[PDB]
Amino acid sequence: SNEDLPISMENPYKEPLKKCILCGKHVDYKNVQLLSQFVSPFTGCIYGRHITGLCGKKQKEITKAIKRAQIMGFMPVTYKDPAYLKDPKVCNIRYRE
């Protein structure tokens, strides 16, 4: 018949699925430097996923690790350890504007 008729395929132009910054990386409660990146510098509050940008699976892991480290004597609760204030900013939040 005719060879120009559309054929059945999976979308070849489909882009790869997005991945959170922590995708494929183990989150440890001992890694206080990583955990501090997701808490408020002034109040120590854990940031929501809309700020942190983490996936649902990693947001839970970070939350559970922060809570564990804070009660085991590794992480402060009411503020962010000043030693980690100069680490890379990975959270979409602006306090001065």
């Binding site: 959170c20 910054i21 922590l22 890694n31 206080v32 990583l34 680490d87 890379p88 990975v90």
Partner: protein
Amino acid sequence: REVLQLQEEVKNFITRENLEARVEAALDSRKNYNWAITREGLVVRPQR
């Protein structure tokens, strides 16, 4: 394969014979679990 790997790790396990020697070695060494993540998903190990 797992049993073979385990049989190799047990060689380094702490025992009552090497307990004191292993305790001194631990006091001298330092282990760091801290590292940071960038907005690009790259690990930034600590420089110390």
